């Protein structure tokens, strides 16, 4: 059957640059302020702020290349092949690095709350040495298909910055790997550590001296609430690609529009760390 993938997305070409420009402005302002305050003046106090500085570094790296996507939303990619590869690599590095920073924040809170008597040296050892090899090295190692497959090419109307796979099984296995690494395993880890944290804090109702859990809980919940509908949309699209859901091509076009809109709305995690720093929430 002929799908004939044509969107006529006249609203997306005027709505996506607006969202991208708003996120670029507030992300570059907030991440520049956070890096200037903590990464230069050494104004960090708690152990969470080192992880939030790493998160702001990855956030600034992504919002540097966000105007390229803002141009590519309405016009097409006339920048180059190397810029296409660099933009895709920076996107994937930020996407995995923010998730692994949040997992490390949850693990640090589990070590601080439960192991409150002996885990002082392990938390410092984590946040000074192990965070790099546990976050940035997997994030850079997961960008090898971004280094290989990402290429700009014609689609018989204009240029497109994307990646090209030899088979569709590669596309669906990379989508399933993206779902499994981005959402499932770190979400399970964060939920397990916070369930243990709540179960141990229920035994310590006599003292309420700590309330640094609210900031990390709000940040993690807002991050996953931002990233949930895009993950649902690409899960439904991956099940479409695996001959499970066969409901015409108008449903596939609706899934494409939903994935684009929710992917642009899922960049609100750029304005999540410094807005929470401004509100002290």
């Amino acid at each position: 059957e002929p799908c004939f993938r044509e969107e006529n997305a006249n609203f997306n070409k005027i709505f996506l640059p607006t969202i991208y420009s708003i996120i670029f402005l507030t992300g570059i302002v907030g991440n520049g302020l956070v890096i200037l305050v903590m990464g230069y003046q050494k104004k960090l106090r708690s152990m969470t702020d080192k992880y939030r500085l790493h998160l702001s570094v990855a956030d600034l790296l992504f919002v540097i290349t966000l105007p390229f996507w803002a141009v590519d939303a309405v016009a097409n990619w006339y920048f180059g092949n190397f810029l296409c590869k660099a933009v895709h690599v920076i996107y994937t590095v930020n996407l995995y690095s923010s998730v692994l920073i949040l997992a490390f924040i949850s693990l640090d809170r589990y070590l601080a709350i439960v192991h409150a008597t002996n885990s002082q040296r392990p938390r410092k050892l984590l946040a000074e040495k192990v965070v790099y090899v546990g976050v940035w090295i997997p994030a850079l190692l997961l960008t090898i298909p971004d280094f290989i497959f990402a290429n700009v090419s014609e689609a018989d109307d204009r240029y497109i910055c994307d990646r090209f796979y030899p088979n569709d099984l590669w596309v669906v296995v990379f989508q399933f790997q993206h779902i499994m690494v981005g959402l499932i395993l770190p979400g399970i880890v964060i939920l397990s550590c916070y369930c243990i944290i709540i179960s141990k804090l229920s035994h310590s109702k006599g003292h309420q001296k700590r309330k640094a859990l609210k900031t990390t809980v709000i940040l993690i919940l807002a991050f996953f609430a931002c990233w949930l509908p895009y993950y649902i949309g690409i899960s439904i699209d991956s099940f479409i690609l695996l001959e499970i859901i066969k409901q015409g091509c108008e449903f596939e076009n609706t899934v494409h529009k939903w994935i684009s809109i929710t992917e642009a709305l899922a960049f609100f995690h750029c304005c999540l760390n410094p807005i929470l720093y401004a509100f002290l929430g």
Partner: protein, 65 residues
């Protein structure tokens, strides 16, 4: 972008059972980095239907060149 949906072909369920007499316009779409589209317009219902690239009728039609 770990997801990659900006370039997909009309490439779904190439049916082998295609009548050679009902094939009026076997439009071969040129799609880069994709499979060879063999979508053919029917004559009984006047609707485009994808054909298999290994079909004998499509091969016999393309072998006249």
């Amino acid at each position: 972008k770990p997801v990659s949906l900006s370039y997909r072909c009309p490439c779904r369920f190439f049916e082998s059972h295609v009548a050679r007499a009902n094939v009026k316009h076997l439009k071969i779409l040129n799609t880069p980095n994709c499979a060879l589209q063999i979508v053919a317009r029917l004559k009984n219902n006047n609707r485009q239907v994808c054909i298999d690239p290994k079909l004998k009728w499509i091969q016999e039609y393309l072998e006249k060149a």
